[PDB]
Symmetry: C4
Subunit: 464 residues, 4 copies
Amino acid sequence: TEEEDLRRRLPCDKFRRKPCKLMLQVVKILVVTVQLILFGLSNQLVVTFREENTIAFRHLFLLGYSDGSDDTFAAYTQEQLYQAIFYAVDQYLILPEISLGRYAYVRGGGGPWANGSALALCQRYYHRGHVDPANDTFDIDPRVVTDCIQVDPPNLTLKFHKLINVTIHFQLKTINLQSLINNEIPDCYTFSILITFDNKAHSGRIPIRLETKTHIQECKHPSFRLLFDVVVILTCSLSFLLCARSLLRGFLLQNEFVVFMWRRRGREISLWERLEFVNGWYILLVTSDVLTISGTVMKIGIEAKNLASYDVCSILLGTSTLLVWVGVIRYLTFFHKYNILIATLRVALPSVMRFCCCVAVIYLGYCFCGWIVLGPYHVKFRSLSMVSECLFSLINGDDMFVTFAAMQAQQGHSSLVWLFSQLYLYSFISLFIYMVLSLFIALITGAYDTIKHPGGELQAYIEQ
Amino acid sequence: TEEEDLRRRLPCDKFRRKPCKLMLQVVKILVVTVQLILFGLSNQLVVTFREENTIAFRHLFLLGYSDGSDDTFAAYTQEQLYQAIFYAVDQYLILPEISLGRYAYVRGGGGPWANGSALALCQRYYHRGHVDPANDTFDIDPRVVTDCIQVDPPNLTLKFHKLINVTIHFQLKTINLQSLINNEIPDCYTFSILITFDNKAHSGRIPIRLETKTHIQECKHPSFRLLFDVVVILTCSLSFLLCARSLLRGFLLQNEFVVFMWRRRGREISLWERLEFVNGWYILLVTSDVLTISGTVMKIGIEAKNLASYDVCSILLGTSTLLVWVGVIRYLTFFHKYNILIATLRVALPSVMRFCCCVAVIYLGYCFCGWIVLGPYHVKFRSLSMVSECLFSLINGDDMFVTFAAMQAQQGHSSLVWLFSQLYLYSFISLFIYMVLSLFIALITGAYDTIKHPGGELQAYIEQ
Amino acid sequence: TEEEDLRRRLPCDKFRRKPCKLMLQVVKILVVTVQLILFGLSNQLVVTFREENTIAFRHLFLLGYSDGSDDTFAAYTQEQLYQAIFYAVDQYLILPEISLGRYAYVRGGGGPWANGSALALCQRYYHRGHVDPANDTFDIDPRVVTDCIQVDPPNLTLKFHKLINVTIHFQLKTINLQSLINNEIPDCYTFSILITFDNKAHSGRIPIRLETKTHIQECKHPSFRLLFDVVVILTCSLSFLLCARSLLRGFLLQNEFVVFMWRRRGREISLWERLEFVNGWYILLVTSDVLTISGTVMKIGIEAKNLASYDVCSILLGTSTLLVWVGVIRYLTFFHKYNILIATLRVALPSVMRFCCCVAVIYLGYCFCGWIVLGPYHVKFRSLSMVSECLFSLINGDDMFVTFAAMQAQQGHSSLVWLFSQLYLYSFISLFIYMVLSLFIALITGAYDTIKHPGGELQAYIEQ
Amino acid sequence: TEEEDLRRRLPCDKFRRKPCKLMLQVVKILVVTVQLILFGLSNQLVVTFREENTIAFRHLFLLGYSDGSDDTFAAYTQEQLYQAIFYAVDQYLILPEISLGRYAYVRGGGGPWANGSALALCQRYYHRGHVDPANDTFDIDPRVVTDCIQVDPPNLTLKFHKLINVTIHFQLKTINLQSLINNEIPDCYTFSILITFDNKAHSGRIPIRLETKTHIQECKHPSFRLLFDVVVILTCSLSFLLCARSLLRGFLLQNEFVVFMWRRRGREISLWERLEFVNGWYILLVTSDVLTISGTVMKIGIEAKNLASYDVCSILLGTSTLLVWVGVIRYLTFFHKYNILIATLRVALPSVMRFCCCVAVIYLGYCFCGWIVLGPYHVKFRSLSMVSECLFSLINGDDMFVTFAAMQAQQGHSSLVWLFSQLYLYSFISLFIYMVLSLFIALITGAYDTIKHPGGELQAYIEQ
Ligand SMILES: *[C@@H]1O[C@H](CO)[C@@H](O)[C@H](O)[C@H]1NC(C)=O
Ligand SMILES: *[C@@H]1O[C@H](CO)[C@@H](O)[C@H](O)[C@H]1NC(C)=O
Ligand SMILES: *[C@@H]1O[C@H](CO)[C@@H](O)[C@H](O)[C@H]1NC(C)=O
Ligand SMILES: *[C@@H]1O[C@H](CO)[C@@H](O)[C@H](O)[C@H]1NC(C)=O
Ligand SMILES: *[C@@H]1O[C@H](CO)[C@@H](O)[C@H](O)[C@H]1NC(C)=O
Ligand SMILES: *[C@@H]1O[C@H](CO)[C@@H](O)[C@H](O)[C@H]1NC(C)=O
Ligand SMILES: *[C@@H]1O[C@H](CO)[C@@H](O)[C@H](O)[C@H]1NC(C)=O
Ligand SMILES: *[C@@H]1O[C@H](CO)[C@@H](O)[C@H](O)[C@H]1NC(C)=O
C-alpha cells in the first residue's frame, strides 16, 4: 500500500511524461481553446457580419425606424399601421434599385407547406371574434385562421379588433465578400427575414419588429483549416482517453481504499471526507471530458442539426479552460512555493456556505418586498424579473442613483407609498452593505482566521 | 418550574405537531405568499395592462407628446396652449375612427354633481383677479370659480393671467381581452381620464399631464380561484389563532417569571434583558398576525372601499414572509449546526446603534451643507428632497461622476462658490468613505471581536 | 488649583444653567438653523421661481433652442448668426402679444452710462483688425470698440472677422404671484436679461447664451417674520457673548496653566499637547461665533450690498450646525455611555494624516499622468480640471465603465497610445483600490488597533 | 569599508549639497514638469483650438451630421450616398461665402505624386470585380485602382458593388488668433482634411468620417520662452550627469560588495536580495535619465520628425514626476518619522504577487467565458476587446446595472441562453467581489500582519 500512498502523494517526476500528456492537453486543450477563439474570432466577425446585416435589414425594411427605437417601435393608428406595411411592401418591390447591397431571392417558400413568395404577407385572426365592449360582451372562437397573400418578386386590410398578428416573410441571398480581407473565400448567405406586427395584447399598441435567421454555406463552385480542426478533435479524443485511464487508476485506488479501510481490521467506517480537496484530479478530468465530448459533438453528430447545439456546446468548453485555466495554475503552482493562496479558499465555503444561505434568506425577504412594492410605480421592479435586477443595485453603483432618487420625485401616487417607498427602499440599501463586507470580512477575518492558522492520510505519513 | 425551563429550551420534538402548525403556516403562510405572488403576477400583467393603457392614452390624447418628454411636456404660448386643447378635443370627437382600440363611453358624469359629458372641459380662475405688474399692484379675490363646458360624444378661451388651471375629464370603457392568454374571462374596464393644463405657478410655463384611474369589474353577462383565496384566508385565521394561543402560553410563562423572580424570595429585581433574542418566537407571531389580519382585511371589510387599502395591506404581508422567510431559517437552522451566523448579528447593534447615531450626527451636518449650498447651482440638491438623494451618492457610484464633475465646469457663477463647491463637496466624499468600512470594519473587527469570542437562565441550566 | 481641575473635568451639573445657555444656543442655534432652512426653503421656492424664470427666458428669447442644447447651443453661419439675433429681436417687439406671462419693462438703461432701451443691441470689435491669413499676416489694434443700437419698446451687420462679441441687454418686470400659495404678499421682480453671442475664440463657432440677474423688492403699495428674524439675530449675539465669556474663562485657565506649569517649580516645559481633544469646547465656540457673526452680517451691513455676500455667509452657518450638530452629540453623548465611538476617530489621523500625504503623493503622480495623456484623446481629461474629475472615477463606479471602455475603442489614433491608454489607465484603477481599503483597513485594523486597546492631567487625577 | 557602510546609511548631511542637486532636480525636474504643464496647458488650449476646429470641420463639411451621430454617421442608399458627396463638394465651392472662419487654401497636392486640387475626389475599386451572388460566383482581381478627380478652388458615379472607398482630400490654412488672449503671436495653421466614405465591408452600410491633421508654424513675417526651454533642457542634462555620477558611485560600491562578499573569505555566496528596497536610489535615477533623455529628444533630434515622437516622449516624463513625485516624499519622509507607511507596501507584493497570478488565473477563465458567451447577444462583450471592458464591470458600478439587467430582458434568443446568460453572468459578479477584499483584506490583514509586526547589513550595524 506504500506505493499507493506514494501515488496519492504524486515533484514526483523530479523524484523520478504522464504530466506531459496532462501538460499536452492544456496545450492540447489550450490549443483547442485557441482554435475556439480563432473559431470564435471568425464567428464574431461573421458575428460582425450578422450584426451589420441586422442593422441594415432593420433600416432597409423599416419605415420611421430610429436607433434606440427598437424598445418602442410600434404602430398606433390604422393609418399608422398601414404605412409601414406598405413601406415594407415597397422594399420587396424596389430592392434591386435602392439597396447598397446585392441581394438575390428565389423560391424558398414558407412556412406552411408551399410554395413561393418570395415573402408571404400573412394575417392571423380568431375564426370567430364578436367583440362588443359597449355591451360588455363578446363571443369568441379562438381558433386562429391564417390568411396569406403571395407576392412574387419582379393593399390588404384586416379589421383591427380582428388582428392577432400580421407577418411578412421573405428570403434574400447575398455573398459575404468581406471574407477576402481575412484571406478567405467569400461565403454564400441566405437571410430569412420575418417582420412581425404583433397585436396579441389587443392593447391599441402594435409593436413592429424584424428578425433574421442566417443559413451559411459554400458558394456553388469551389480543407486545410478543416483538416486541422479534425486533428484537434482527434487530439481531444486522446485526452479524453487519458482521462478515462486516470479515472480508472483513481477507481482502483478507491477500491483499495474501500477495501483498505474495511480490509485491514474488517475496518469501519466510511468517511465523506468533507471537501476533500485538492479536488480536480478527478473532478477536473470529467469536466474536461464533457468539454472534450462536446467539441466533437458540435463538430460531429448534432452539428448535422446546427444552431442551438453548436452554441450550447461552446459553453461547456469554457468550463474546461478556466478549469483548464484553473488546473494548470494548481499544477502550475507546484505547491506554489507551499500553495498558500490555494488553502485560503477552502475554509471559507464551510462557513460561507452557511453564511450564503442565511444571506439568501435575508435576501429572499428583500426580494419579496420587491414583488409587492413594485407594481404601483417604476418599471425596474415588476417581476422576479426586475426583482432579480435590483439585486444588482445593492452591490453596485449604477442602480442606486437612478431608482432611489428618480423614484423619490417619483411616478409616486399614494401619499403613504411615497412615504412607503423611501421607508423600505432606504431600509434596503443599508442592511446588506454593512453586513456584506463582514460576511466577506468575518470570513475575511475568518480567512485571516484561516490566515491566523495560515500566517505561520496523516497516519500513512507518520508511517512513512 | 423545571417543566417551564424545558419549555423555554424547546430538537425538543425529537426528544419526544405544534411545529407542523408553525410549519404549516409558513407553507400556509408561504402558500398565501404564493397566492399573493400569483395575485401579484396577475396584477402586474393587469398592472401590465394598466401601463400599456397609460402609454396609449398619453399618446392618444396628447399632441406633440414625446417619450421622456413627460418631465418637460408643457405649453408656452397661447397659440401653444390652444393647440393641445383643440388636439385633445379632437380625440374625443374622432376616437372611434382613429384608435387601434375599441372604447365605449356613456353617462359617467363628474366631478361636481351632474351630469353627462362624457368629458367636461373645465376652467378654474380667481373670482377677482386684477393683476397689474406695470404699476406693481394687484387686487385679488382668490376664491376659485369653475366654469365647465359639456361635450356630448357623437373653441373656448380663458385669459392667461386669469388661468389657474384647465382640466379635461372623460371616461372610456373597454374589454380586457388579453385575459384569454392566461385562460381567464375578459374583464370590463372603465378608464377615467383627466388631462390637466396646470397654471398654478403663473410662471409662463404650463405643464400638461394625463392621468387615469381604472375601475375593474366583471362584464355584464357571466368561483374556483375565489373560493381558493377564501380557503387561504380561513387558513390564515387559524394561524392567527395558533399565534394567539402561543402568545397566551408565553404570557403565562411571563407571569410565572414575573411571579417567579418575585415569588421565590419576594424576589427583585426586574431585568430589561437588553436584546433578549432569540426574539421572534413572540415578536414574529404578532407581525404574522398583522400580516394575517391585513390579508383578510384586504379581501374583506375595507376592500369594499378599494384602492389604497388593498395596496397598503400588501406591504404588511411582505414583512411576514421575510419575517416569514426569516423565521424559517432560524427554525430552519435548528441551531444551524450551532447557529454561528445568527450570533454574529446581535453584538453589533449594541455598538452599531451607538455608531449609527453619531454617523447620523456626522451625516446631519453633511445634510445641512446641502441645504445652504444647493440653491445656487444644480437641481440634484435643492430640498430635503434631493438632500436625501445625495445620501445615495456617497455610498454608491452612480452619483459621483455625474455631479462632482458636471458640477465643476458647472452652472457655476460666483468665483468663490466654484471655489466653494469643490471645497466642500470634495470634503464630503472622503470622510464617510474611510470611516464607513471601519464602522462596518470596526464592528466587522468587532464582529471579528464578536468572532474572536465567536471563532472558538444560566442558573437554571446549572440546576438542570 | 483643585477647583480648576474640577472645571476642566466639567455630569458636573448633576453633581450640583450654563449648559442651558449652551443648550439654548443649539436650540437657539438650532432654531436659527431652522430659520435658515425656512429662509432656505423660501429661497429655494423663490429659487424655484428663478429656475422657472430662467428656463422660460431661454425658451422665450432663444430660437432653435433645445433642452440639453445649452452645452452646444451656437451659430455656425452668418445666415445662422443673423436669425437668432433677429429672433431675439422679435421677442422684444412682440412679447405682450405672445408670452404666457405678464412682463413690463421701462427705463432701466445699461450698462455704459445712459439711457434707455430697454435693451441695447451692442457690438464689440477691435478698433483695428486687418486679418489676412492668405498672406499669413495681420495688423491689429486690440482696443475694443463698442457700438450699441438702442431699441425702444413699442437689421445691423458686423463683419465676422470683426466680431468679438454681440450682446443684447434688456430688463423686464413681473409680479411673483406664486407667493399667494405660501400665504405671502406677491413680490416685485425686475429681471435683467443678457444674451451673448460670443466670438472671443474666433473659431468659426459662436456659442449663444442667455443669463438673468434678479432684483427683488416689495411692490409699490403695502414685519412679523422680519421681526422674528431680528429677534433670532439678537439671540445669536447673546450666544456669541456667552462664547466670549467662556473663552475668557478658558484663557484664565490657560494663564493658570501657563502660570501653573511654570509657576510651581519655575516649571518647564511647554507641551503642544498634540491633538489635545476633546477639542470643541473652545474651537467650536469660535466657529459658532463666526457663524453667528455672519448671520448678523448677512442680515445687516454688507446686506446693503446684497448678493454674493448673502450666499457666502450662509456657507459659514453650515459649519456651526454640523459643528452645531456635532457638538450636541458629544455634549449629547454625555460620555455616550463611555464615549467609545468618539475615541475611535483620534488615533487614525495621527497615522492617517501621514498616510494621506503619501497617498496624495502617490496621487500626485497619478494626476500628472493625466496632464500628459489627456490632450490626445477624450474630453474627460484635459486640465487640472478634469484631472480632478478623474479622482472621482477611481473611488466610485460612474466613471469606470464610461471612460475605460469608451476610451478603448476610442477616438484613439496613435497605435502606441491605444497601446498606451490601456497600459496606464489600467495601471491606474488597480493601485489605489487594493491600497485604499488597507489605508482605511490598516487604519481600520489600526482602528481595531485603536479597537484592540479600545475593545477592552493624569497627575492631577492621581492627586484627587 | 566602514566608510562604505556609512555611505549606504546616508540625516547624514545633518551629521555633516549633493542633496541640493538631487533637491534641485526635482525642482529642476519639478520645474521642467512645470514647463511641461505650461507646455501642456498651451497645447491643451491649442489642443482646445484643435478640438474646436474638428467640431467645426465636421459640421462644416458634413451633411445631415448630428452630435453623437459620429458613432453611426453613414450612407445607406445611392441616393443617400451621393448627397453628402455633393454636400461635401458644395463646401469646397462656397466656403468663403458661408463659413464663420477665414480659410485660405492653395497648392498642397496629395497624396499620390502631384499636383494641386486643392482637394482630390478619389475612387478606389477592384481592378476586376465580377460579383454575382445570384449564381453564387464571383471573379476578382483584388488589385486596387485609384481614380481621382481634381477640383480647383474658384457629378461622378462609381458602381456600388465596385466601391472600396471614396475619399475627399483638401487643405485649408487659417490664422490662430485666439493666441492674443494668452498674449502670444497668432500661429499659422494648415489643416489637412480627409473625408472617407468607407465601403471596405461591402455591407450595404457606408460609414462617413472626417479627420484632420494640423501643421503648425510661425506666420510669414516676424526667443524668450524658447530660450527658457533650452535652459531647462540644459539643466536636465546636468541632472542626468549627476545621476550617472551617482550611478558610478553605486557601481563602485557594488564592486566593493562584489569584491567584499567574495574578498574577505574568498567569500560566497551571492544574494538576490529579493526586493532589496528601499529601491529608487538607483532605479529612480535611471528612469529620471530616461525622462531627461526624452525631453531633450522631443525638443531635439526626432522633433525634426514631429508628431508621434513628441507625444510618446511626454509619457516618459510622467513616470519621473510621480517617480519624481514619489522619490521626494521618500526623501521627503526623511524616515517620515520612522517611515511606517513606506514599510507597509513591501510585504504585500511578495504575497500579493502570488495572489495576483492566481487571480489572473481565476480571471483568465472568467475572461474566456466572455469569448464564448458574447457573440450571441450584446455588443459589450464581443472581442478581447470588450472582454477587457467587462473587467471594469466587476470592480465598479457603472457596468453592473446596464448589462446585467439590460441583458436579462435581452436581445436574448435561445431559451437556454437566457437561462444561460443569468446562470453565468450572475456567477461572475459574486466570486471576485467576496474574494477581492480578502485579497486586499487578507493582505490587508496581512498588512495588519505586516501591521502586527508593524504596529509595535545587520552584521555591519552590529560591528558599528
Ligand atoms: C401554392 O399555394 C396554394 C395555396 O394558396 C397551394 O394550394 C398550392 O399547392 C401551392 N403550390 C405550390 C407549388 O406551392
Ligand atoms: C403571432 O405571434 C406569436 C409570437 O408573438 C407567434 O408565436 C404566433 O405563431 C403568431 N401567430 C400568427 C397567426 O401570426
Ligand atoms: C346638467 O348641468 C347643469 C349645469 O350646467 C345642471 O344645472 C343640471 O342639473 C345638470 N343635469 C343633469 C341631468 O346632470
Ligand atoms: C388645480 O390643480 C390642482 C392640482 O395641481 C388641483 O388640486 C385643483 O383642484 C385644481 N383646481 C382647478 C379649478 O382645476
Ligand atoms: C442717450 O445715448 C446717447 C449716446 O447714443 C448719449 O450721448 C446721451 O447722453 C444719452 N441720453 C440719455 C438720456 O441716456
Ligand atoms: C465679451 O464677452 C466677455 C465674456 O466672455 C466679456 O467679459 C466682455 O466684456 C465682452 N466684451 C464685449 C465688447 O462684449
Ligand atoms: C497633374 O496630374 C496628372 C495626372 O492626372 C499628372 O500626370 C501630372 O504630372 C500632374 N501635374 C502636376 C503639376 O501636378
Ligand atoms: C480605404 O480605406 C482604408 C482605411 O479604412 C485605407 O487604409 C485605404 O488606403 C483606403 N483605400 C482607398 C483606395 O481609398
